[PDB]
Amino acid sequence: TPSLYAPQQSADPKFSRPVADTTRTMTVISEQVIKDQGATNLTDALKNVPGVGAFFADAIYMRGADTSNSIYIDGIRDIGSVSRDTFNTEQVEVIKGPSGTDYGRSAPTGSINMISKQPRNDSGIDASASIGSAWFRRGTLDVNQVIGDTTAVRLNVMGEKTHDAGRDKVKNERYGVAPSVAFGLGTANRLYLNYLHVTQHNTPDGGIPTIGLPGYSAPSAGTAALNHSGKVDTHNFYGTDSDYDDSTTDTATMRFEHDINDNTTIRNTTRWSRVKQDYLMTAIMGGASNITQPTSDVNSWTWSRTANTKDVSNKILTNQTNLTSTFYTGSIGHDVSTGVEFTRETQTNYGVNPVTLPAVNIYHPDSSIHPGGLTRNGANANGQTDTFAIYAFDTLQITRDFELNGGIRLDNYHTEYDSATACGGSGRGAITCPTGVAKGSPVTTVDTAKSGNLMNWKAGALYHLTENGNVYINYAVSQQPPPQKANTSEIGTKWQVLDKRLLLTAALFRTDIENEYGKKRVEGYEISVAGNITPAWQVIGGYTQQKATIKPYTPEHAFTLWSQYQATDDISVGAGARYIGSMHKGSDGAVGTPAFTEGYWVADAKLGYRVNRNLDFQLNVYNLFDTDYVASINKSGYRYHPGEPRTFLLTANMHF
Ligand SMILES: C[C@H](CO)OC[C@@H](C)OC[C@@H](C)OC[C@@H](C)OC[C@@H](C)OC[C@H](C)OC[C@@H](C)O
Ligand SMILES: C[C@H](CO)OC[C@@H](C)OC[C@@H](C)OC[C@@H](C)OC[C@@H](C)OC[C@H](C)OC[C@@H](C)O
Ligand SMILES: C[C@H](CO)OC[C@@H](C)OC[C@@H](C)OC[C@@H](C)OC[C@@H](C)OC[C@H](C)OC[C@@H](C)O
Ligand SMILES: C[C@H](CO)OC[C@@H](C)OC[C@@H](C)OC[C@@H](C)OC[C@@H](C)OC[C@H](C)OC[C@@H](C)O
Ligand SMILES: CCCCCCCCO[C@@H]1O[C@H](CO)[C@@H](O)[C@H](O)[C@H]1O
Ligand SMILES: [Cl-]
Ligand SMILES: [Cl-]
């Protein structure tokens, strides 16, 4: 049977073949891995993919490219930019390399697809309660109930509140509710209805000065004392008691499926979703012109505070039709996947008055101040993108051993954008009032439309060398809206060994991007392992070696491995280790800021104890050696996020 650590099939019907028979570098992170590791969010889940992390500012990076706009939920773009909890996730599908034929407007470096939980054919209840470091509390509930011969419901509930063990005042609070019903299970006609609501209320973290890090230099001769005063206390909060981050997600999904016959299925999915967010966060600046020296003693010196504010609403409405069909023409088998997608996305950024923040003491920051919140001023920016997309995939079974595949996708989009600024101010990009226009009036500065076409295509071939091993090649030609062109070549090999419960892959890749700014190249090597070495022994991890020629936020070496062993009927033990290579900032870094970050190791451990079939406990320890490191650094180079210290998570799991 399948390993819980190596799901055999993508959930997306655009993938007609099992992962091991797919000519792409594709890692699936199962629900069981997420649970065993205590992963509460997408970023945590992604520790199982080497090199993928939120190294910037915080945004997730893959192969040197921001991936924030290449996150999907059930194959539909995730709108807005909020952290994603794992409570409603069945698995996470990560493609390393292009996926424009599958999603159109995605990063040619990789995509991430979170697969939502659906009603199952069995009845059961799981619940979890957790306590952890820094007042961490979390509760989850997952109820599945079969309600007739062909109907099932599922409900997932989550609540979490925590402070931050490494950071004063930073905190996160959220809850989520995700009810579903499915009709017609086990028949030719199925209807899935999904809803999801999440609310978050957080204190955001702008990070801390980079003084004293490797590569840091004071920005002037007159501030040379900062070459000797040392790293600031990594627990220091440089924001204010007014900083906050609020968001809500509301998503409704309706999926109809009709089997035309045993080998042909048509699907229609409608989703409406809205993500609202507003925040006030403190960004600190440490250039010569940002530093105040009330006396010559550095204990009195300050850096300037900048308010990073946002008040935004994103909406999407999309309808997607997919058709899959398997049939022969002569001796050639066909696996077809084709469809059409209609989408409207909108975004409103609500204008707010400028917020002014007092300077912050470098070594003794005073965050007790209450500058106040945001006030809308009615000068808004509004955007709309309408997209029509059509695609076709086919895998040709030429012989038992040889398969050819290909896909093509066409996107046509229309984008409208308008923006108004309240005139007469001075902060940020202020505007002088036109003649006769009273101060503070919103003045339209942009009002434009645009249209464009994207073509994406890919072709691959795969040869089964043995019953267990194959070799494959894949080629993809991508393009995004500014048209950014990307070509990718890939050759790899995939092996299912140890009763086919363990998947081993290796791939070489080369990607060339033009019109990103000139041409870039990223090439390298990827190895991965997932599944069961023995019935008691589960592993998942990988290794990446890569080089990103320019012509940033990309480790050239990265490793991760998680290993779990069922030591007795009641005792299991797990441990993980990940290496993040050093990274370099070629551009944008201010004078004297670190031009590089050092590589580091992080280790994690787990102990599980089963009391009976209804109750088991789990202890997770994160950053077991309490290692000090730079988790990320912003583009300016003035501020960074320190790696979290050692933390603990203790969970009671109940099953009924
Ligand atoms: C399915 C249906 C369809 O409509 O929706 C029902 C669902 C939407 O209801 C869930 C929601 C109404 O529950 C709100 C509750 C979870 O929040 C409590 C929280 C605000 O207190 C913490 C508080 C600020 O902080 C504590 C301290 C700081 O004072
Ligand atoms: C779990 C519990 C029991 O424990 O049972 C849950 C179940 C009784 O709740 C019902 C829920 C699952 O319904 C989903 C609802 C949100 O459907 C959206 C539909 C209207 O689609 C509109 C479509 C996308 O968009 C329309 C367009 C205008 O945007
Ligand atoms: C107690 C916990 C549980 O481990 O942690 C202890 C930890 C401290 O030591 C873990 C270490 C012993 O694990 C080694 C293993 C995870 O490496 C597998 C990798 C080399 O892939 C080879 C590949 C699958 O091999 C193919 C197969 C045919 O042999
Ligand atoms: C008893 C507890 C709980 O199981 O284990 C404590 C401790 C032994 O765990 C160490 C942890 C770091 O292992 C990570 C694991 C995934 O193994 C990966 C492999 C790289 O380790 C070989 C090894 C560390 O490297 C040797 C050398 C190359 O540095
Ligand atoms: C089952 C795993 C048990 C291993 C426990 C060893 C923890 C090693 O962690 C140790 O913590 C010390 C105090 O924080 C630090 O000073 C050491 O540098 C670090 O090695
Ligand atoms: Cl996240
Ligand atoms: Cl592609």
Numbering used by the authors: 50 to 106, 116 to 540, 563 to 596, 608 to 642, 656 to 760
Q: Which sentences from the paper describe this structure?
A:
The ferric iron uptake (Fiu) transporter is a TBDT responsible for import of molecules containing the catecholate functional group. Members of the TonB-dependent transporter (TBDT)3 family drive transport of their substrates through interaction with the energy-transducing protein TonB. The structure of Fiu consists of a 22-stranded transmembrane β-barrel characteristic of the TBDT superfamily, with a number of extended extracellular loops that might serve in the initial steps of substrate binding. In addition to its role in iron uptake, Fiu has also been shown to be important for sensitivity to antimicrobials that share the common feature of a catecholate functional group or the analogous dihydroxypyridine moiety.
The structure of Fiu was solved in three different crystal forms, revealing Fiu in two distinct states. In crystal state 1, extracellular loops 7–9 of the β-barrel were disordered, as was the extended extracellular loop of the N-terminal plug domain, which occluded the lumen of the Fiu β-barrel. The disorder of the plug domain loop in crystal state 1 opens a large cavity in the interior of Fiu to the external environment, whereas, in crystal state 2, this cavity is present but occluded in the lumen of the Fiu barrel. In crystal state 1, removal of this subdomain opens a large channel between the periplasm and the external environment. Therefore, it is likely to be undesirable for Fiu to exist in the open-channel state, which would result from simultaneous displacement of the plug subdomain and disorder of the plug domain loop. Although the internal cavity would be inaccessible to Fe–DHB in the closed state, because of the fully ordered plug loop, it would be accessible in state 1, as this loop is disordered. Glu-108 is disordered in the open state of Fiu and is not within bonding distance of docked Fe–DHB (5.3 Å) but may form interactions with polar substrate groups in vivo or generally stabilize the binding pocket. The observed crystal states may represent conformational transitions the receptor undergoes during substrate binding and transport.
